[PDB]
Amino acid sequence: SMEQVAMELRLTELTRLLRSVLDQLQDKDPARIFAQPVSLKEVPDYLDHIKHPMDFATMRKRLEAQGYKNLHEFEEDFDLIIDNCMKYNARDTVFYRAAVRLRDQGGVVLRQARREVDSIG
Ligand code: NA
């Protein structure tokens, strides 16, 4: 049908838009603390603390399969990265402080990203 084609183009444009949103949010972690999933070889007890780990590489693979249906779903994953980091690591660590600064600078990107998703439709 044409109406599924029209749905599919919308998804396809959104994914293109979220690519840009992702790339900007990843430009706010220049250490690359959040680039890859936490190694279970290096931190064996990590899944005793964190039931839904999340990182940027994972979020990229879901995107290029067009797996994000709205902006909420994208935001939900992004928030896991920050919330997982600030729970596992203490206040006085470079990990927690990298999550705080990513949160505060990514708020600027996601607030205008919300207006662009609405505005086009
Ligand atoms: Na903690």
From Swiss-Prot:
Subcellular location per UniProt equals:
Nucleus; Chromosome
Q: What tissues contain this protein?
A: Highly expressed in testis.
- Boundaries of each Bromo domain copy? 9-113
Domain of life of the organism in this record? Eukaryota
Give the sites of the cross-link named Glycyl lysine isopeptide (Lys-Gly) (interchain with G-Cter in SUMO2).
K41
Quaternary structure? Component of some HBO1 complex composed of KAT7/HBO1, MEAF6, ING4 and BRD1/BRPF2. Component of the MOZ/MORF complex composed at least of ING5, KAT6A, KAT6B, MEAF6 and one of BRPF1, BRD1/BRPF2 and BRPF3. Interacts (via PHD-type zinc finger domain) with unmodified histone H3. Interacts (via PWWP domain) with dimethylated and trimethylated 'Lys-79' on histone H3.
Q: What job does the chain carry out?
A: Scaffold subunit of various histone acetyltransferase (HAT) complexes, such as the MOZ/MORF and HBO1 complexes, that acts as a regulator of hematopoiesis. Plays a key role in HBO1 complex by directing KAT7/HBO1 specificity towards histone H3 'Lys-14' acetylation (H3K14ac), thereby promoting erythroid differentiation.
Q: What is this protein called?
A: Bromodomain-containing protein 1
Query: Which organism is this protein's natural source?
Result: Homo sapiens (Human)
- What taxonomic lineage is listed for the species of origin? Eukaryota, Metazoa, Chordata, Craniata, Vertebrata
Q: Which residues of the full protein are shown?
A: 555 to 674 of 1058
